[PDB]
Scaffold this active site. Structure first.
Site, PDB file in Angstrom:
ATOM      1  N   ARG A  37      19.992  37.017 -25.622  1.00 14.27           N
ATOM      2  CA  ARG A  37      18.699  37.410 -26.215  1.00 14.27           C
ATOM      3  C   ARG A  37      18.437  36.684 -27.517  1.00 14.27           C
ATOM      4  O   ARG A  37      17.261  36.419 -27.818  1.00 14.27           O
ATOM      5  CB  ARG A  37      18.604  38.924 -26.399  1.00 14.27           C
ATOM      6  CG  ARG A  37      17.707  39.584 -25.333  1.00 14.27           C
ATOM      7  CD  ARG A  37      17.838  41.082 -25.329  1.00 14.27           C
ATOM      8  NE  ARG A  37      16.829  41.752 -26.138  1.00 14.27           N
ATOM      9  CZ  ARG A  37      15.547  41.728 -25.779  1.00 14.27           C
ATOM     10  NH1 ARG A  37      15.195  41.079 -24.674  1.00 14.27           N
ATOM     11  NH2 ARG A  37      14.677  42.357 -26.553  1.00 14.27           N
ATOM     12  N   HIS A  69      26.656  28.694 -18.216  1.00 18.17           N
ATOM     13  CA  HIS A  69      25.265  28.957 -17.902  1.00 18.17           C
ATOM     14  C   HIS A  69      24.500  29.174 -19.227  1.00 18.17           C
ATOM     15  O   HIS A  69      25.009  29.909 -20.066  1.00 18.17           O
ATOM     16  CB  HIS A  69      25.130  30.188 -16.996  1.00 18.17           C
ATOM     17  CG  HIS A  69      23.871  30.298 -16.169  1.00 18.17           C
ATOM     18  ND1 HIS A  69      22.585  30.322 -16.697  1.00 18.17           N
ATOM     19  CD2 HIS A  69      23.708  30.388 -14.833  1.00 18.17           C
ATOM     20  CE1 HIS A  69      21.734  30.407 -15.661  1.00 18.17           C
ATOM     21  NE2 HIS A  69      22.362  30.448 -14.494  1.00 18.17           N
ATOM     22  N   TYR A  72      18.815  32.903 -19.912  1.00 13.36           N
ATOM     23  CA  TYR A  72      17.727  33.044 -19.042  1.00 13.36           C
ATOM     24  C   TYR A  72      16.412  32.982 -19.772  1.00 13.36           C
ATOM     25  O   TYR A  72      15.385  32.732 -19.213  1.00 13.36           O
ATOM     26  CB  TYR A  72      17.732  34.373 -18.237  1.00 13.36           C
ATOM     27  CG  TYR A  72      17.333  35.624 -19.016  1.00 13.36           C
ATOM     28  CD1 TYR A  72      18.249  36.273 -19.842  1.00 13.36           C
ATOM     29  CD2 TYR A  72      16.083  36.242 -18.964  1.00 13.36           C
ATOM     30  CE1 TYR A  72      17.958  37.407 -20.562  1.00 13.36           C
ATOM     31  CE2 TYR A  72      15.747  37.388 -19.667  1.00 13.36           C
ATOM     32  CZ  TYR A  72      16.694  37.971 -20.477  1.00 13.36           C
ATOM     33  OH  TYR A  72      16.453  39.108 -21.220  1.00 13.36           O
ATOM     34  N   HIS A 109      18.443  27.080 -15.359  1.00 12.53           N
ATOM     35  CA  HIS A 109      17.249  27.062 -14.503  1.00 12.53           C
ATOM     36  C   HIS A 109      16.169  26.218 -15.202  1.00 12.53           C
ATOM     37  O   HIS A 109      16.062  26.287 -16.469  1.00 12.53           O
ATOM     38  CB  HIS A 109      16.756  28.471 -14.251  1.00 12.53           C
ATOM     39  CG  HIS A 109      17.741  29.384 -13.586  1.00 12.53           C
ATOM     40  ND1 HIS A 109      17.396  30.588 -13.020  1.00 12.53           N
ATOM     41  CD2 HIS A 109      19.083  29.289 -13.408  1.00 12.53           C
ATOM     42  CE1 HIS A 109      18.514  31.141 -12.562  1.00 12.53           C
ATOM     43  NE2 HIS A 109      19.577  30.403 -12.766  1.00 12.53           N
ATOM     44  N   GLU A 145      19.884  23.905 -12.109  1.00  6.53           N
ATOM     45  CA  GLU A 145      20.123  24.807 -10.971  1.00  6.53           C
ATOM     46  C   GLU A 145      18.846  25.028 -10.217  1.00  6.53           C
ATOM     47  O   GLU A 145      17.777  25.237 -10.808  1.00  6.53           O
ATOM     48  CB  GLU A 145      20.674  26.148 -11.494  1.00  6.53           C
ATOM     49  CG  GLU A 145      21.253  27.016 -10.386  1.00  6.53           C
ATOM     50  CD  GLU A 145      21.593  28.436 -10.765  1.00  6.53           C
ATOM     51  OE1 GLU A 145      21.643  29.294  -9.842  1.00  6.53           O
ATOM     52  OE2 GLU A 145      21.818  28.713 -11.981  1.00  6.53           O
ATOM     53  N   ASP A 179      22.620  26.871  -5.766  1.00  4.40           N
ATOM     54  CA  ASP A 179      22.911  28.296  -5.602  1.00  4.40           C
ATOM     55  C   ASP A 179      22.401  28.672  -4.224  1.00  4.40           C
ATOM     56  O   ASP A 179      21.223  28.523  -3.887  1.00  4.40           O
ATOM     57  CB  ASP A 179      22.206  29.061  -6.735  1.00  4.40           C
ATOM     58  CG  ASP A 179      22.438  30.555  -6.708  1.00  4.40           C
ATOM     59  OD1 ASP A 179      22.717  31.183  -7.783  1.00  4.40           O
ATOM     60  OD2 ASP A 179      22.356  31.152  -5.590  1.00  4.40           O
ATOM     61  N   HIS A 182      19.664  31.358  -4.008  1.00  4.20           N
ATOM     62  CA  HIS A 182      18.373  30.796  -4.413  1.00  4.20           C
ATOM     63  C   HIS A 182      17.774  29.943  -3.314  1.00  4.20           C
ATOM     64  O   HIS A 182      16.575  30.018  -3.027  1.00  4.20           O
ATOM     65  CB  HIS A 182      18.549  29.988  -5.688  1.00  4.20           C
ATOM     66  CG  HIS A 182      19.001  30.860  -6.848  1.00  4.20           C
ATOM     67  ND1 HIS A 182      19.237  30.334  -8.097  1.00  4.20           N
ATOM     68  CD2 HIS A 182      19.253  32.179  -6.948  1.00  4.20           C
ATOM     69  CE1 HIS A 182      19.634  31.359  -8.888  1.00  4.20           C
ATOM     70  NE2 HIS A 182      19.670  32.499  -8.228  1.00  4.20           N
ATOM     71  N   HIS A 216      26.774  27.497  -6.845  1.00  2.67           N
ATOM     72  CA  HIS A 216      26.892  28.938  -7.002  1.00  2.67           C
ATOM     73  C   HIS A 216      26.900  29.533  -5.576  1.00  2.67           C
ATOM     74  O   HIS A 216      25.967  29.346  -4.800  1.00  2.67           O
ATOM     75  CB  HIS A 216      25.753  29.548  -7.824  1.00  2.67           C
ATOM     76  CG  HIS A 216      25.734  29.110  -9.282  1.00  2.67           C
ATOM     77  ND1 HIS A 216      24.684  29.432 -10.088  1.00  2.67           N
ATOM     78  CD2 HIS A 216      26.669  28.436 -10.002  1.00  2.67           C
ATOM     79  CE1 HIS A 216      24.974  28.954 -11.285  1.00  2.67           C
ATOM     80  NE2 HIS A 216      26.157  28.349 -11.284  1.00  2.67           N
ATOM     81  N   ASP A 229      15.071  36.776  -6.196  1.00  7.58           N
ATOM     82  CA  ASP A 229      16.464  36.472  -6.550  1.00  7.58           C
ATOM     83  C   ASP A 229      17.289  37.734  -6.600  1.00  7.58           C
ATOM     84  O   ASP A 229      17.327  38.431  -7.631  1.00  7.58           O
ATOM     85  CB  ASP A 229      16.524  35.748  -7.883  1.00  7.58           C
ATOM     86  CG  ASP A 229      17.963  35.340  -8.190  1.00  7.58           C
ATOM     87  OD1 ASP A 229      18.162  34.894  -9.364  1.00  7.58           O
ATOM     88  OD2 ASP A 229      18.771  35.242  -7.300  1.00  7.58           O
ATOM     89  N   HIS A 231      21.223  38.730  -5.417  1.00  6.06           N
ATOM     90  CA  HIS A 231      22.488  38.278  -4.847  1.00  6.06           C
ATOM     91  C   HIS A 231      23.179  39.409  -4.053  1.00  6.06           C
ATOM     92  O   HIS A 231      22.881  40.595  -4.229  1.00  6.06           O
ATOM     93  CB  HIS A 231      23.439  37.815  -5.937  1.00  6.06           C
ATOM     94  CG  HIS A 231      22.937  36.718  -6.841  1.00  6.06           C
ATOM     95  ND1 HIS A 231      23.733  36.170  -7.825  1.00  6.06           N
ATOM     96  CD2 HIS A 231      21.721  36.110  -6.986  1.00  6.06           C
ATOM     97  CE1 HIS A 231      23.003  35.279  -8.494  1.00  6.06           C
ATOM     98  NE2 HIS A 231      21.762  35.202  -8.047  1.00  6.06           N
ATOM     99  N   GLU A 261      28.640  34.307  -8.138  1.00  2.98           N
ATOM    100  CA  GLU A 261      27.834  35.218  -8.940  1.00  2.98           C
ATOM    101  C   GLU A 261      27.500  36.438  -8.084  1.00  2.98           C
ATOM    102  O   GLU A 261      26.443  37.065  -8.147  1.00  2.98           O
ATOM    103  CB  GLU A 261      26.534  34.581  -9.472  1.00  2.98           C
ATOM    104  CG  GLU A 261      26.773  33.261 -10.220  1.00  2.98           C
ATOM    105  CD  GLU A 261      25.449  32.565 -10.507  1.00  2.98           C
ATOM    106  OE1 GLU A 261      24.685  32.344  -9.538  1.00  2.98           O
ATOM    107  OE2 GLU A 261      25.155  32.275 -11.708  1.00  2.98           O
TER     108      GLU A 261
HETATM  109 ZN   LIG Z   1      23.150  30.763  -9.672  1.00  2.00          ZN
HETATM  110 ZN   LIG Z   2      20.213  34.308  -8.885  1.00  5.47          ZN
HETATM  111 ZN   LIG Z   3      21.541  30.649 -12.668  1.00 12.70          ZN
END
Ligand SMILES: [Zn+2]
Ligand SMILES: [Zn+2]
Ligand SMILES: [Zn+2]
Length: 285
Positions: A37, A69, A72, A109, A145, A179, A182, A216, A229, A231, A261
């Site tokens: 964050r 990674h 986000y 991403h 990714e 991934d 994804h 991934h 998305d 998983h 993941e």
């Molecule tokens: Zn991923």
């Molecule tokens: Zn994902």
């Molecule tokens: Zn990712």
């Protein structure tokens, strides 16, 4: 050789990610180098850096086996130029942390257009973001990714990845991570070996395996082409177990971090062991 692990927790310090990877018998790992964050993280201390490097060396994780990674919240294609600059600042900071830690890869991403700019213009902004970061750092490859394509996120088509790479000046320091969740969510099928081969031939025509720098390995709770998305643990989702056997038996996936993941960390050691076993177990087509 394949390198197989999980995105483990860095709770209690970055070195604990290496320790956690070792405890599940991983031969690769992913981590965040900071909370996601905070715009700007307190600088890495020499103490944190040395403890991380010491743990990686104790448990035989080289830079080639570690796939950090980014946060986000970074949007390298943001249509608001002032927000773009803040994302670029954060991304340069993330790349610098990798350099300081002895890491050579950073997975991210690509970005999102927020319905305010064209896809073409967003992809061009992302390539320029990469160029900026590569001019400000050394030794770290920007690993793009692919995405599920939720909302206005780009990177759901392989052609997006290729368009970004085309705009990068130092192509030696750009690559891609695929991934599986994804890809499936974006409409690249993986449910049979034949479909896996079709998807990866498409990848080969558009991007090329020379750019592949990580995977991934995720099953999918969401459905084919859903552009959601979500998983799942291997075998429990809508992809199923055969895609993962197929990947494990294909030498094009050697030499790169292969990172779970999946959504139940209690079974990661079992998922890693199962993946390792599929390399030599009964052949799939
Ligand atoms: Zn991923
Ligand atoms: Zn994902
Ligand atoms: Zn990712």
């Amino acid at each position: 050789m394949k390198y197989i692990g999980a995105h483990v927790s860095a709770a209690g310090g970055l070195a604990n990610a290496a320790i956690r990877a070792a405890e599940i018998d991983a031969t690769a790992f992913a981590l965040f180098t900071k909370n996601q964050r905070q715009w700007r993280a307190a600088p890495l201390t020499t103490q944190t850096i040395d403890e991380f490097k010491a743990a990686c060396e104790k448990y035989h994780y080289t830079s080639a086996q570690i796939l950090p990674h980014d946060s986000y919240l970074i949007n390298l294609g943001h249509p608001v130029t002032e927000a773009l600059e803040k994302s670029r600042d954060a991304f340069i900071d993330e790349m610098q942390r990798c350099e300081q830690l002895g890491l050579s890869l950073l997975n991210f991403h690509p970005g999102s257009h927020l319905m305010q700019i064209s896809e073409e213009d967003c992809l061009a902004r992302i390539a320029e973001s990469i160029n900026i970061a590569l001019d400000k750092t050394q030794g770290v490859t920007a690993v793009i990714e692919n995405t599920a394509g939720q909302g206005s996120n780009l990177g759901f088509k392989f052609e997006h990845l290729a368009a970004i790479i085309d705009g990068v000046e130092d192509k030696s320091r750009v690559g891609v991570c695929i991934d599986t969740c994804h890809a499936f969510a974006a409409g690249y099928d993986l449910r049979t070996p034949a479909e896996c081969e079709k998807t990866f031939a498409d990848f080969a025509r558009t991007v090329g395996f020379k750019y592949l720098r990580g995977m991934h390995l995720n099953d999918a709770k969401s459905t084919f082409g859903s552009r959601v998305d979500r998983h799942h643990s291997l075998g429990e989702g809508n992809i199923g177990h055969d895609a993962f056997r197929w990947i494990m038996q294909d030498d094009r996936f050697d030499g790169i971090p292969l990172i779970l993941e999946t959504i139940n960390p209690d079974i990661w050691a079992e998922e890693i062991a199962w993946l390792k076993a599929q390399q030599t177990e009964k052949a799939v087509a």
